[PDB]
């Protein structure tokens, strides 16, 4: 899976620059995910995106973060490894089984303590958090795309001024543009909420944005008010 010119170019990045710098337990988590879910493992954050997130977290001096959507935990383990010793992550996903695929790797890496995994749909947890308000340096959104705009309007209140909200899938499979037509039910579930998110973020004066053509598309939003 890639949004790049060729599969060979994507593999070149991984072979040259990501795999040689990838923590052993991140590799093991990827392999466990492929073994369990087969081609569904595509849903996970890929290794070049992971190494990018890791550097971003360090450059930002992030310490407290929020993850909306976890799956088997590739981005979660990436984040826990990148944060300082006193880092803490709140990570929300209704699928505890998927989390438990990655958990042994998280544990062997020694970073389980940095993670508060919450088995829930995210909206209800975020609503409760917004009902002292918790504050985060960084938020990663990689979950159910029809809710991404709704997550933005909660996350913009939970991230600190100067902090970052990152959205995965903002160039979803390269299919946000297409010469072919998509069928209504699939369009409404996938391309449409991303096309709409992208307009929403571009129009939001409360953030600065940078859409990055890495992974499945990552849009960084820096909160300015
Ligand atoms: N309402 C909801 N709230 C939080 N997570 C949800 C959700 N609906 C679906 N999801 C989750 O979003 C996930 C998307 S895949 C997340 C990928 C992950 N960041 C990685 O690196 O592997 C699935 O695990 C799914 O359970
Ligand atoms: Mg997703």
Query: Among 77, 97, 96, 95, which Cα is nearest to 23's?
Result: 77
Task: Return the closest-CA partner of residue 53 out of 86, 24, 85, 26.
Answer: 26
CA of 68 to the centre of ligand 1 (A): 7
> Looking at the DSSP assignment, which residues form a beta bridge with residue 65?
89, 138
In angstroms, what is the resolution? 1.3
CA of 172 to the centre of ligand 1 (A): 15
Residues followed by a break in the chain (C to N exceeding 2.5 Å) are: 131
Q: How far is CA 139 from CA 13, 15, 79, 142, 206, in A?
A: 26, 28, 11, 10, 15
Regarding the domain delimited by 7-163, which CATH topology (the fold level of the hierarchy) does it fall under? Rossmann fold (3.40.50)
Q: Helix 148-158 to helix 191-202 angle, to the nearest 10 degrees?
A: 40
| Index of the ligand 1 atom closest to the CA of residue 94 | 26
Experimental method: X-ray
Q: Is 214 within 8 Å of 167 (Cβ atoms)?
A: no
Dihedral-angle region of residue 217 (phi above 0 means left; psi in -120 to 50 means alpha; beta otherwise): left
Q: Which helix (H) or strand (E) holds 139?
A: strand 136-141
8-state DSSP, 134: -
What ligand has the least distance to the C-alpha of 44?
1
Region for 61 from its dihedrals, namely left if φ exceeds 0, alpha if ψ lies in -120 to 50, beta otherwise: left
The CA–CA distances, whole Å, from 177 to 3, 31, 184 equal 12, 31, 15
CA–CA gap between residue 103 and residue 77 (Å, rounded) = 9
Per domain, the residue ranges of the chain are 7-163
| Residue with tokens 């550097």, as numbered in its chain | 55
């Amino acid at each position: 899976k890639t949004i790049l010119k060729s599969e060979a170019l994507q593999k070149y990045i991984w072979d040259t620059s990501a795999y040689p710098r990838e923590h052993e337990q991140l590799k093991r988590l990827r392999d466990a995910t492929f073994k369990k879910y087969g081609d569904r493992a595509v849903m996970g954050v890929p290794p070049d995106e992971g190494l990018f997130l890791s550097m971003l977290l360090k450059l930002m001096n992030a310490k407290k973060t929020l993850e909306i959507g976890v799956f088997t935990g590739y981005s979660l383990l990436t984040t826990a490894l990148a944060l300082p010793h006193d880092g803490q992550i709140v990570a929300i996903d209704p699928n505890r089984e998927a989390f438990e695929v990655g958990l042994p790797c998280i544990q062997k890496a020694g970073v389980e303590h940095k993670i508060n995994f919450i088995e829930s749909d995210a909206i209800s947890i975020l609503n409760e958090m917004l009902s002292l308000k918790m504050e985060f340096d960084f938020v990663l959104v990689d979950a159910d795309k029809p809710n991404y705009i709704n997550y933005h309007e909660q996350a913009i209140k939970l991230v600190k001024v100067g902090g970052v909200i990152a959205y995965d899938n903002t160039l979803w499979r390269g299919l946000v543009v297409s010469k072919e037509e998509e069928v209504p039910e699939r369009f409404r579930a996938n391309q449409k909420p991303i096309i709409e998110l992208n307009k929403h973020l571009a129009s939001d004066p409360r953030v600065e944005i940078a859409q990055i053509s890495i992974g499945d598309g990552v849009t960084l939003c820096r909160r300015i008010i």
